[PDB]
Amino acid sequence: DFGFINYAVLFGYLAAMLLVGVYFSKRQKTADDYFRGGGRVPGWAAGVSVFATTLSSITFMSIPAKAYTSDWTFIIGQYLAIAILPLVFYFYIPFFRKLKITSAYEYLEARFDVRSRLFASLSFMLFHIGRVAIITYLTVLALRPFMGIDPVVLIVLISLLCIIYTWMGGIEGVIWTDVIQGLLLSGGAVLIFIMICFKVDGGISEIFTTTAQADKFFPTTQWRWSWTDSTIPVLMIGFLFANIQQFTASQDVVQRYIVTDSIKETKRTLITNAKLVAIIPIFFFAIGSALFVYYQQNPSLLPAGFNTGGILPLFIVTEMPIGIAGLIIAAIFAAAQSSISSSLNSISSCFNSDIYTRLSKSSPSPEQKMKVAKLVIIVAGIFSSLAAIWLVLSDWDAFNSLIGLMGGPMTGLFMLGIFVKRANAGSAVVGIIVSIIAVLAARYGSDLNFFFYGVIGSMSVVIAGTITAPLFAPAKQLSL
Ligand SMILES: CCCCCCCCCCCCO[C@@H]1O[C@H](CO)[C@@H](O[C@H]2O[C@H](CO)[C@@H](O)[C@H](O)[C@H]2O)[C@H](O)[C@H]1O
Ligand SMILES: CC(=O)N[C@H]1[C@H]([C@H](O)[C@H](O)CO)O[C@](O)(C(=O)O)C[C@@H]1O
Ligand code: NA
Ligand code: NA
């Protein structure tokens, strides 16, 4: 078994997350508290929270498996995510801040009209219900063979517990848990790397040389155009657009831009996040390369037909010492939970502003907004968790892959509003329609690589919403 000591580390970590939630529950009086944090978050904390929100068990498990089986080409993705940040700061964040947004999609009603706002908000909320279910599913897939408990108990520990502290704690409790979880997964990744270096005969130098000799850093055979394969050009355009989605059009990140009290602290949020993205992800790639060298030096330690997605967890549970092993498991929990908590709170912030407030005939009182803010964390939590239970016990993708395609059009709407002065409500709507059709064509009637779905979706809104602008009444002004 995992053992009592390893467990006690895990349950200490879980108890610490709940206690942070209890601490921040006292200050939740209004929706402003619960979603905007009353302007009490410093920049550095919001920036760690952005990193921990975006980096989930998807990165933690997949990126090492990917470097193990192939190469580091995907890391170009991380650096493109940093490269766009000044553009976000200069062109997007001033609108978000000056409008005193609760939900990012309020910008779309201000720039265009309610149809664009609601299309984007519903696509966000549905996508993130999926992201939570997926994050929870992968974590369970990773840990289940090695914990000695039923999948459902594991879901209680990963998901239910996360729901409780998120519910009590508001965006402040979500952010301060994220800071701990962000730093825990970061040190955890560094510590895994170190340990694998100490177990490879020849250490870090042999890990480097073997990897470079196998052409597993940046193979030039991947510098080629393709419509179907995930080559360097495809993933560069693909990650550029995914990153623009993540940092301009996605409520879980955009929410962190408005919790700081000044633009000075807002810059600190982006700067802190940039430092983490420039340093930490490299360790996840380095881990897959290290493990590859380690299991080439120790061929009999893998069962034949072992799934390469389980090699990292296999190494943790079989090769890391007692206490340390329990802490790495807590760090995988921390990668999952920091993303789950942010997605639940953002889902509730969108529901509160874009659905409940915007569509009520009269404006809800402060006390009413607070109630619904809390309630939607439970409801979304329940739905996300059931889905995760279904994914586990059965062996669905349709809904998820379908709603995922709406990320492109949501992101195009922001690019169009922000950069095309003549675009207007109607031309944005023609843009959505064109975008939707184009993405369904890409996904279901072609063999195009998945990296193209976002670019197509985005650029379809931009192009159709630009060329059809003169057919509708002149654009709303919106002067900041
Ligand atoms: C998915 C692919 C589809 C893309 C095909 C291109 C679609 C382009 C549509 C262009 C026509 C838009 O239709 C829009 O209709 C309203 C009524 O419908 C027009 O009407 C508006 O202006 C006119 C000016 O005379 C007024 O008489 C009218 O009362 C007012 O509402 C808008 O000026 C026009 O902008
Ligand atoms: C460029 C890239 O790989 N982006 C990935 C990011 C980054 O790894 C992370 O934000 C650190 O920069 O993590 C995810 O959002 C995640 O783990 O759920 C998946 C996404 O595909
Ligand atoms: Na996370
Ligand atoms: Na979070």
Author numbering: 5 to 399, 404 to 488
Article, verbatim:
The sialic acid transporter of P. mirabilis (SiaT) is a secondary active transporter of the SSS family, which use the Na+ electrochemical gradients as the driving force for the uptake of extracellular substrates. The uropathogen, Proteus mirabilis, catabolises host-derived sialic acids as a source of energy; the genes required for the transport and degradation of sialic acids are encoded within the nan operon. SiaT comprises 13 transmembrane helices (Tm0 and Tm1-Tm12) with the N- and C-termini facing the periplasmic and cytoplasmic spaces, respectively. Homologues of SiaT are found in a wide range of pathogenic bacteria including Streptococcus pneumoniae, S. enterica, Staphylococcus aureus and C. difficile.
Here we report the high-resolution (1.95 Å) substrate-bound outward-open structure and a functional and biophysical characterisation of SiaT. The structure is in complex with the sialic acid N-acetylneuraminic acid (Neu5Ac) and two Na+ ions. The sialic acid binding site is near the centre of the protein, lined by residues from four helices (Tm1-Tm3 and Tm6). The electron density in this site corresponds to Neu5Ac in its β-anomeric form as seen in the Haemophilus influenzae periplasmic binding protein (SiaP) of the sialic acid TRAP system. Tm1 and Tm6 adopt a distorted helical structure within the membrane bilayer at the point of contact with the substrate, which has implications for how binding drives the alternating-access mechanism. The negatively charged carboxylate group of Neu5Ac forms hydrogen bonds to the hydroxyl and amine groups of Ser60 and Thr63 and a salt bridge with the guanidinium of Arg135 (Tm3). One Na+ binds to the conserved Na2 site, whereas the second Na+ binds a new position that we term Na3. One ion occupies the conserved Na2 site, which is located between Tm1 and Tm8 at a prominent kink in Tm119. Na3 is 6.5 Å from Na2, towards the cytoplasm, and ~14 Å from the substrate binding site. At this position, the Na+ is coordinated by the main-chain carbonyl group of Ser342 (Tm8), the hydroxyl groups of Ser345 and Ser346 (Tm8), and by the carboxyl group of Asp182 (Tm5).
